[PDB]
Amino acid sequence: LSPEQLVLTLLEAEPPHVLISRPSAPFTEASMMMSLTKLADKELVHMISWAKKIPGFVELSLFDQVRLLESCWMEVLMMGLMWRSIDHPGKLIFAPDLVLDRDEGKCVEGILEIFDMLLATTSRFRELKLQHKEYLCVKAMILLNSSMDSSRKLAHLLNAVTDALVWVIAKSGISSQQQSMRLANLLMLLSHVRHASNKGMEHLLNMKCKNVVPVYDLLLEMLNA
């Protein structure tokens, strides 16, 4: 399978756009956390289907499939948020009917900190002019590199996606030195995704313990693990 065809399969694995079915209206600490958790739950279901559409994922042991998804889910959710927000400076496009402003994160203690982190990283991808195909490769890499017989299968897959990203960059026709520079810049931003991730879950976990947000089966499970 060539890189171009591997990337096509990622495009075909893309989850559908999700809405939370919410009539436009102001946000409160309760209506925000409830919306964010309800959205996370719906997206998690779609994320599972997405992972299964990545060539080779279902070939991994059920134990590996579960471990990869339980550790990277939040990072994958945030990478998607950033790609959707790339063309809307200053805004976090969680979903069409869930567009939040930086000053609205002040309605929730501890979240304005995370929004700033997400908006910063987003602005960075915006500066690099992140392309859709790079986004696809990067998202897949997040899932496959979140690991801390089935083992070599995983390595092979991660290597395949990495080769696909390099290929995407090579098509932009830019300087070879600039292709290496770009590859490193995109990959270095992943540390900032994993950072906003650990912070985002700590915040969510604190929220769960306080029973502030309703009970969401899949999300609760992903959170607990």
Binding site: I48, S49, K52, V58, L62, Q65, L69, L218, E221, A225
Partner: peptide, 9 residues
């Protein structure tokens, strides 16, 4: 939950 979605379509 995560497991049943991984084994069904």
């Amino acid at each position: 939950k995560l497991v049943q979605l991984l084994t069904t379509t």
